[model samples]
Target: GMQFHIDDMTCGGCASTVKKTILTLDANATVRTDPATRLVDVETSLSAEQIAAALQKAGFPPRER
Candidate 1:
């Protein structure tokens, strides 16, 4: 699994969009977001770069760790 920080996620919709973007690359992607921590946790087959690209294409930027 991997974790990410999404700078523009201000609401539930933002979280959903990010999740959808990741899922597009890996259907089995598991995503969880914590508003308090501003952390997005994901379990997927895609690489961090791929996740970032997908998020960017979906109108958001993502950083992974």
Candidate 2:
């Protein structure tokens, strides 16, 4: 399990972008984004560092959780 907070995610579009970014790395990755919490929960085999890197590369660098 991994968690990321995307500061630039101000709308559903942002969440969708983040989801697509994660999916690019692992198509089977499970992702849940909460608008109120501004948090994205990801369940995948990839390590947290890898996930964070992917998010960063997608222009949504995740904060340490």
Candidate 3:
């Protein structure tokens, strides 16, 4: 399990974008995002570094919590 705080993900559209990026990065991943909290929770095989890269490249840089 992994957690990140993405300040840019402040709306449904942003959350959806983040979700899509993670899913695309790893099909086996289960991602949960909440716009209100600006948090993303992921159950994935990938490392935290990988998650950071994907989000950063997706234009929603994540801050590890």
- Give the best candidate by TM-score: 3
Which prediction has the highest lDDT against the true structure?
3
lDDT of 1 by residue, 1-65 (tens): 88888888777888888888777788888889876666789887878788888888888787786
**RMSD after CA superposition, every candidate:** 1.2, 1.0, 0.5
TM-scores of the models, in the given order?
A: 0.86, 0.89, 0.97
Between 1 and 2, whose TM-score is larger? 2
Residue 14 alpha-carbon offset, candidate 2, angstroms:
0.7
lDDT of 2 by residue, 1-65 (tens): 77888787768988898899888899999999987777999999999889888888888888856
lDDT of each: 0.81, 0.86, 0.94
**Model 2 TM-score?**
0.89
lDDT of 3: 0.94
Residue 60 C-alpha lDDT in model 3: 96
User: Compared with the true structure, what per-residue lDDT tens digits does model 3 show for residues 1-65?
Assistant: 88999999999999999999999999999999988899999999899999999899999999988
Checking candidate 3 for backbone clashes, the offending pairs are none
Winner by lDDT between candidate 3 and candidate 1: 3
* TM-score quality measure for candidate 3: 0.97
